[model samples]
Target: HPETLVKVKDAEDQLGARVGYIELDLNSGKILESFRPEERFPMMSTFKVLLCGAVLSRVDAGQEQLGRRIHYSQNDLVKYSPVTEKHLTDGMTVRELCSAAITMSDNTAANLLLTTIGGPKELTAFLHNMGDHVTRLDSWEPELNEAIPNDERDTTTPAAMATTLRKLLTGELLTLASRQQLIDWMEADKVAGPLLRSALPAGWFIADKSGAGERGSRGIIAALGPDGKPSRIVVIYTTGSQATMDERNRQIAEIGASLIKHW
Candidate 1:
């Protein structure tokens, strides 16, 4: 933990980008430091974390089983999107869907979980009942169906999202076994945006989630760093950027590198 402040100052001076968010020790549940951690942004796939919690809470309540099968027919094959466009091979279980949703950021899996978990109202209520107020789930579509206005989307803050993940990782959200399983699934996540994955050291295990959205766009990247300590969490949201995808990704990667080194 030495050199934290000096590195942080260097990041601010060299990067010239504001570091306004939260960093926590996942093991101790302590807030290491924060800057404008309450700033809100579109939740993107990060919203799936809340939906996942709701589903697991139901499992804890004996209302559902992760092994339960969720059939994905041809109609369910949301448009030829990114990952979940094709059929989910037969016999996919709820656990697999959850894993896909969290690790892969699969939209189809997310839509199915939202439907199976009693929709947004129940999910919102569940988070509220847990004393959480920062996350809101808005809509679930099979695909990029009809375009809608931007105001109707889900939103969350970095501090809130970090808190949710900490709760899950520390056995505060679900039964110990269920919590471990969720973390394991997250560790297996497949999406590799350079911002997060490249920032951490090689062979470091990370059990985290990501979110991406348009207008302009935003993403959440949380992880446990190489030191086996609770690594920092980085959430970045950018709007009104005219940069192409490659350029945007490069910027994100650069920001991540700066934060990880300093943090």
Candidate 2:
């Protein structure tokens, strides 16, 4: 455990920023390791996880369907959208929105889903109902502009995120089918980069979501071990990093490698 802390801190130091991280053993519901795990940081696109939960809750309650179609206009457009650029004129289903929100970190898709679920108030309430007190969504996508400070933006702790991820996997907050659907979307996430995925061993599957902005980068990876059992949950949130994106990514990759080696 101490070694994990040392290695992770060393990696954090390289970034020249404050970092909050945690590793939970999903099987036993124990915190295997952590560093400033309670410190909060901007969730960035990672807040999409909460948005997904809110939408799925509606689905589970029989009030909504994943296939429900949502039409959009140019007014709904947001920057840095891979999926939205292609479908901005056509619109998409809730399922596709969820996929784009997670995998592509599509800003337009995230804002569409957030608004569809009744905005940040509903999302905050949903997080509260799930026993997440520290995570808050004060603004929707496209609103996280350059004027906002990292701490003043949408925020959550590594510990809080780890708890939510566990609940998703353990069926506390979602039905089996919905859980699988969320996991499937996360497993298909294409935005995680090398921060949490590159160092994972073969046969270990990670269901995850990631975030990055002018402030810094954040990611959560829920790994299923080679045996197909719940293995480990890793959450890392960093802010105020002076390193270039390439260097920050390499530091994050090193942190992941250390975790896999020490885990």
Candidate 3:
């Protein structure tokens, strides 16, 4: 743990990018580690997790129902929507949308649900309600990944996001069933294997979502010890890195490995 700063600094230096990270105990809200925690980076697909959480908030209030079906035509599709693209004819349940958005980072599913939950503004409002003012969604997918310098359109700080994730998943925000669904979807994330998930030693438990474009972002909002003891939230993000996604992710993976070894 004493070597944290130097290791985090080395990762940022090597990536030629601003790297921000935080690790927290989900139960007690204790900050176990942090570096450049206030540094901002786009949420990329990580925002999908939050968006779906917003949807669940509505569900918890009886304002939304996961059993409802969302019917759409061919034009509803967007890039990287593997799951929704296949369901063009029959549409999908609200539960399916949440699962696709969180587990696969499905672009179309996220967009559809974003619209269902009243668009980017509502999601931003939802984050605010969760006590997170740093995370914002000024636009939808594809364009949301622009990650333009100084734009601040769709970005979040590592500390703020990690805090909000803990509150939403383990706090009073969602009902128990809703929180479990969120955690389960994140645990099933197909995109995590190459990023934070890959860095972990075998048998360690992690529930994560990774965003590739916009310089790469990964959030392990919940994790357990190698012995499956408790929940620790870890969020890592980078931006302005000209490096390939593989290099950026490897840098993140290395950081993840260090946290695993130390904490």
Candidate 4:
């Protein structure tokens, strides 16, 4: 435990930022390690997970279909989205949008999913119902650009995020099928980079959703040990760091490595 604490502090000192992190033993539902887990940080695209959950919840309720197709106009395009880059003209299904939103962190896809699921209020309500009262999704993607300096923009604490993920994976938020689909999409995420997936040993499986912005980076990885049992749930929410993307990613990887080593 002392060595793990040193690793966490080392990462914190190297970044010189406000870092919030938590690792949970999913099987036993216990906190393994944490730092500033209660402090709120900008969620960035990580909020898309909640948005996707909202949509999927509606789908499970028979209010929406995953196959429903939505047409895209020029106005639907948002910057920093690979989804828009490839399929700007072609319409996409709700399932495809959800996949792009999570797997690629596609801004346009996230906005589309948000609008289809009744906007930010619905997502916040869903989170509140799930016992996450403080986390909020204040704005969608492009609107978020304007709200950056405002601390009230989309944000959550590491503990809140970990709790949400625990509920999600434990089948409290979605049906069994929907939960599995969400986990599968997270496993296939294309933009995960080095945040969580990179730190695991070979053969381990991680279903993760990651986020980054000018404020900093955040990630939630649900790691299943090689035996397919839930091994660890890692959440990192950082802010006020001037570290480059690589440095932040490396620090995150180091944190993951330490957890893997100790667990």
Candidate 5:
């Protein structure tokens, strides 16, 4: 296992990027595998995953309904609204927005989810109230991806993100239905689907929300199940390299492979 972790550290250096990782055991809530667990990395669109979880919590509390239609105009559209840009007129249901936001990483859909749950401030508060102290959401899309070096704004530590992602998907954080809904969205994620999946061993399961931003930043907060085993949370982030996103992804995927190999 230590050798597996070493391989990941080796890969990080080979790639010449600052990488942070945490591989958590789902059943025991243990930090089984990790590197740079305390460092902050810009979250990018990965915030949308928790963004949707917050909305689902309200739905579980009878404060919101997924079926409720949130109608918007063309002006509401933002860059990378891949799915929402096509539905400017009819708008989209809350469920649809969550689907678009996670499944497609739709920036416009994330904004709606963000605004629906009261914007960046509330999102940060939501994490705080849930026992996550190091994760913060300071702004909206594109702006949130502004990963200035040495800046802590709108960033998350591997420890904080993995733990929070675990809690959000586990326990009584949300109703069974709500938790399952969150998982469903991540399960259908398109962002990390292609490369991340190809990087894992055949038949391994992965549900994740990945992000990318300035300064060669790319991060993924996710859960993985190898064959018949219960899933484990795997958070990997890379930054400070002027490398291509494809390269960053390959490095992240290599780390993921190390995790399962060690396990």
Candidate 6:
């Protein structure tokens, strides 16, 4: 297992991936190990993972309810969103909205949840309270665009994201009951086709959230792959990709799948 950790590190260097990884054997609290784990990058939709955690925390604290209705009103619409156009027949439940945001990486759902949970500033504060200092959420701003020269982006270091997921897996973010419920929602996310899901063999339990944008993409794969014994947690975030979409996706899949098998 210790040697396996070395192999994972080697693979990261071999593939030329801008990666951050940490693996904690769940049964034992040992961090089997990590590589470049503290590196930071643009989070894309992965920021939603923490936002979702924050929302669940609020719910568990009795400040919100799972069954609460979140109407997809016009105010929720953003410039590039397909999700914002549909008005809910009876409005979506908080659970449904969260699922959509995570699994589908729905931008509108993210905005809606951000609004429901008290905006970006509040979300950042919540993350800070939980000791996640390197993560940030920045919604698009018109005045802060090219003319004013400001970056509108959200980002997290690989270590922070992995640490947060580690807590979630351990049921430390919220109650055990709530953590399982949130993981269930995260499992239903549809974008796994590119990273761990795309790389690994069929029929594995990979519960994770992914993010991608124009410049690059990143994702966390916390699952038991076909290795079938006690599957280790594999956290991968790839960025600074100058390659084409297909090229990058191929590398992502190849590197992801190979790490486990080669290890």
Number of the predicted model whose TM-score against the real structure is largest:
5
Model 5, position 123, has a per-residue lDDT of 94
Candidate 3 displacement at residue 119 in angstroms: 0.2
Give Cα-based local distance difference scores for all models.
0.64, 0.77, 0.80, 0.78, 0.82, 0.65
Which residue pairs collide, candidate 3? Answer: none
For model 4, how does the per-residue alpha-carbon lDDT over 79-136 read when each residue is reduced to its tens digit?
8788856876678999999999999989899988888877888888889988899778
lDDT of candidate 2? 0.77
lDDT of 4 at 182: 81
The numbered model that scores best in lDDT is 5
Candidates' RMSD to native: 4.2, 2.0, 1.8, 2.1, 1.7, 4.2
The C-alpha local distance difference test score for the whole of candidate 1 amounts to: 0.64
* lDDT (tens digit, per residue) of candidate 1 on 195-253: 56666667666666765555335465465676554454545544333445555455556
**TM per model?**
0.81, 0.93, 0.93, 0.92, 0.94, 0.81
| Worst window of 10 by summed lDDT in candidate 5 | 142-151
Per residue, candidate 2 scores C-alpha lDDT tens digits across 1-263 of 67667767886778877778888887776888888888777787887866887888899999889999889888888787788778756679999999999888898999989888788878988888888887888887766532224445477888988888778766567898988888788888898767767887777777888888675554454544544444777788787566888777777777777776766
Global Cα lDDT for candidate 4? 0.78
Candidate 2 stretches with Cα past 4 Å from truth are 145-152, 227-229
- Cα error, candidate 5, residue 200 (Å): 2.5
Residue 231 lDDT, candidate 3, scale 0-100? 69
Candidate 1 collision pairs: 103-189
Q: Write the per-residue lDDT of candidate 5 for residues 1-263, one digit (tens) a residue.
A: 68657766875777687778888888778988788899878888788899998899899989899999998888888788899998877889999999999988898899888889899999999999999989899998867744545678898888999999989888999999998889888888886754457667877777888787766777888887978333788887776677777777777777666666666
Candidate 4 residue-wise lDDT at 188: 82
What is the lDDT ranking, best to worst? 5, 3, 4, 2, 6, 1
